[PDB]
Ligand binder design. Structure first.
Ligand SMILES: *[C@@H]1O[C@H](CO[C@@H]2O[C@@H](C)[C@@H](O)[C@@H](O)[C@@H]2O)[C@@H](O[C@@H]2O[C@H](CO)[C@@H](O[C@@H]3O[C@H](CO[C@H]4O[C@H](CO)[C@@H](O)[C@H](O)[C@@H]4O)[C@@H](O)[C@H](O[C@H]4O[C@H](CO)[C@@H](O)[C@H](O)[C@@H]4O)[C@@H]3O)[C@H](O)[C@H]2NC(C)=O)[C@H](O)[C@H]1NC(C)=O
Ligand SMILES: CCCCCCCC(=O)N[C@@H](CO[C@H]1O[C@H](CO)[C@H](O)[C@H](O)[C@H]1O)[C@H](O)[C@H](O)CCCC(=O)Nc1cccc(CCCCC)c1
Ligand SMILES: CCCCCCCCCCCCCCCC(=O)O
Ligand SMILES: *[C@@H]1O[C@H](CO)[C@@H](O)[C@H](O)[C@H]1NC(C)=O
Ligand SMILES: *[C@@H]1O[C@H](CO)[C@@H](O)[C@H](O)[C@H]1NC(C)=O
Lengths: 98, 267
C-alpha cells in the first residue's frame, strides 16, 4: 500500500482575472481506488475533469485532474485526496506560483 | 525509440465484484482506452486503428474481448481454488507491448504484477514466474503453459502483431507524433528559492537553466516532468539564492518548437 503524492500547478501563467486551467497530478499510490476533489475556498468544484487512470514503470498508479479557474487575490485553490493508505483526506493548496 | 504499452488494470474486490480497465500509450500519447463498461476498444486518436482495415480491427478486438472474459473467469476460479490462503481484495496489472528501434525491428514484453509487485512475464515460448514471486503461482503458471493455443497466440501478438500494428500507428499518426508545441515560461519565488515555470511544451525533451549572463548556474534543480491535460508538458527549475543577488539572473529555455529562438526571462 502506497501513499498518493499530490502536485498542483497551472497550465498558463497565473494572472489575476484571466481564465486558466488548474492541474492536480496525483501519483505513486496503490491500490488504485482513489477519491480526488478540487476545491475553491474549501468547497468542492463541480466540473472537474479526470484523465484515465494509468500506471508507471514501477506499477504505482497516477491520474491527472484539471479544472477551469480564474485566479484572483481573494480565492484559494486546493486538491483533496482520499485514499485507503491515509487515515484522513490529504489536502494540498495551490501555492499561487505553480 | 517509440514504446507501445498496453496497460491493463484489474481490481477484484470480492467474489461478486471485479473490473478490468485498459489504457494504451504510444510513447507519451494515449492512443486507446478500454473501459470495463464498454464492449469495444475506444479510440483516443483519429489514427488509433493504425493501418488496420475495419475487419482486421474487429478480429483483433474480438480476440481481446474473448481474453478479457477468460482472464476474469480464470482469476476468480484461481481465487476460489486457493481460498482461504489467497483472498480478496486483489489487484492485477499487465504491461504488454513493444519498443520500436531505429530501422531495425523491435523487442516485445509482457509483464504481470500482483498486489503492485512484478511476478510473471511471458518470454520466449512460455509464461514464467520471476525470481522472488510467491511460490503458489508456480502451479497455475505450469497449467497456463500447457495451453499451447494460448502460448501460440501470445507469441504471435508479441513477436508479429505488435510491431506491425505500431508501424501502422507511426505512419497514420505522424503529424500528431511529430507535433511541436511552444513552452510558455514565468518566474516566481533573506534566502529565496527562485522558480522558473515552463508549460505547454511538446515533445518532452527540453532544456531549462538559470543563468547569470552566459554562465549556467549549476545550483539549478530541475523538477519532475508533469503532464498538462492537453498532451503538453510542465516543468519547473529552481535555484536557491541569497537576498540581493537576484539581479542579473535569468531563466533560459531551449526547445525544438522555438526554432533556435530561446525564451530568456530576466528576474
Ligand atoms: C517469438 O520470439 C521468441 C524470442 O523472443 C523473445 O521472447 C518474445 C516473447 C519477446 O518478448 C521478444 O522480445 C524476446 O526477445 C521465441 O522464443 C524462442 O523460441 C525458440 C524455439 O521456438 C527457443 O529455442 C530453443 O532454445 C532452447 C534453449 O533455450 C535456452 O538457451 C538460450 C541461449 O542458448 C536462451 O535464449 C533461452 O532463454 C534459454 O535459456 C533449446 O534447448 C531448444 O533446442 C531444442 O529444440 C529445437 C527445436 O525448437 C531442436 O532443433 C533442438 O535440437 C533442441 O532439441 C530451442 O532451440 C528460444 O529459447 C526462445 N527464446 C527465448 C529467449 O526463450 C518464440 O519462438 C517466437 N515465437 C514465434 C511464434 O515467432
Ligand atoms: C495479454 C494477453 C492476451 C493474449 C490472448 C490470450 C488468448 C486467450 O484469450 N486465451 C483464453 C482462451 O483459450 C482458448 O482459445 C484460444 C484461441 O482463442 C486457444 O485455442 C486455446 O487453446 C483455448 O484454450 C484462455 O482461457 C487463457 O487462459 C486466458 C487467460 C489469460 C491469462 O494471461 N491468464 C493468466 C492466468 C494465470 C496467471 C496469470 C498471470 C498471473 C496473475 C497473478 C494471479 C494470467
Ligand atoms: C498483448 C500485447 C499485444 C500488442 C498487439 C498490438 C495490438 C493491440 C491494440 C491495442 C488494444 C488492446 C487494448 C487491451 C489491453 C489489454 O486488455 O491487454
Ligand atoms: C464488493 O466490493 C464492492 C466494491 O468495493 C462493494 O461496493 C460491495 O459492497 C462488495 N459486495 C459484496 C456483495 O460484498
Ligand atoms: C465489468 O464488466 C463485466 C462484463 O461486462 C460485468 O459483468 C461486471 O459487473 C463489470 N463490473 C463493474 C464493477 O461494473
Amino acid at each position: 500500500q502506497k501513499t498518493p503524492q499530490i502536485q498542483v500547478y497551472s497550465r498558463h501563467p497565473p494572472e489575476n482575472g484571466k481564465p486558466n486551467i488548474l492541474n492536480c497530478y496525483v501519483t505513486q499510490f496503490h491500490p488504485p481506488h482513489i477519491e480526488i476533489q478540487m476545491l475553491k475556498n474549501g468547497k468542492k468544484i463541480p466540473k472537474v475533469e479526470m484523465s484515465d487512470m494509468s500506471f508507471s514503470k514501477d506499477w504505482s498508479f497516477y491520474i491527472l485532474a484539471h479544472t477551469e479557474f480564474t485566479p484572483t487575490e481573494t480565492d484559494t485553490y486546493a486538491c483533496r485526496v482520499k485514499h485507503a493508505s491515509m487515515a484522513e483526506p490529504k489536502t494540498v493548496y495551490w501555492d499561487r506560483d505553480m | 525509440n517509440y514504446t507501445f504499452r498496453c496497460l491493463q488494470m484489474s481490481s477484484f474486490a470480492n467474489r461478486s465484484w471485479s473490473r478490468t480497465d485498459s489504457v494504451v500509450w504510444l510513447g507519451d500519447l494515449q492512443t486507446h482506452r478500454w473501459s470495463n463498461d464498454s464492449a469495444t476498444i475506444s479510440f483516443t486518436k483519429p489514427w488509433s486503428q493504425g493501418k488496420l482495415s475495419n475487419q482486421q480491427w474487429e478480429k483483433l478486438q474480438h480476440m481481446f474481448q474473448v481474453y478479457r472474459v477468460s482472464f476474469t473467469r480464470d482469476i476468480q476460479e484461481l481465487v476460489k481454488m486457493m481460498s482461504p490462503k489467497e483472498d480478496y481484495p486483489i489487484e492485477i496489472q499487465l504491461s504488454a507491448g513493444c519498443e520500436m528501434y531505429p530501422g531495425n525491428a523491435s523487442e516485445s514484453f509482457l509483464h504481470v504484477a500482483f498486489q503492485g509487485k512484478y511476478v510473471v512475464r511471458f518470454w520466449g515460448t512460455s509464461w514464467q514466474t520471476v525470481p522472488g514471486a510467491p511460490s503458489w503461482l508456480d502451479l497455475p503458471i505450469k497449467v497456463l503453459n500447457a495451453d499451447q493455443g494460448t502460448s501460440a497466440t501470445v507469441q504471435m501478438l508479441l513477436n508479429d502483431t505488435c510491431p506491425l500494428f505500431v508501424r501502422g500507428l507511426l505512419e497514420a499518426g505522424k503529424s500528431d507524433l511529430e507535433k511541436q508545441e511552444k513552452p510558455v515560461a514565468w518566474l516566481s519565488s533573506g534566502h529565496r528559492q527562485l522558480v522558473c515555470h515552463v508549460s505547454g511544451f511538446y515533445p518532452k525533451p527540453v532544456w531549462v537553466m538559470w543563468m547569470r549572463g552566459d554562465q549556467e548556474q549549476q545550483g539549478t534543480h530541475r523538477g519532475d516532468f508533469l503532464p498538462n491535460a492537453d498532451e503538453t508538458w510542465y516543468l519547473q527549475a529552481t535555484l536557491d539564492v541569497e537576498a540581493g543577488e537576484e539581479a542579473g539572473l535569468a531563466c533560459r529555455v531551449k526547445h525544438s518548437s522555438l526554432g533556435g529562438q530561446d525564451i530568456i526571462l530576466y528576474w
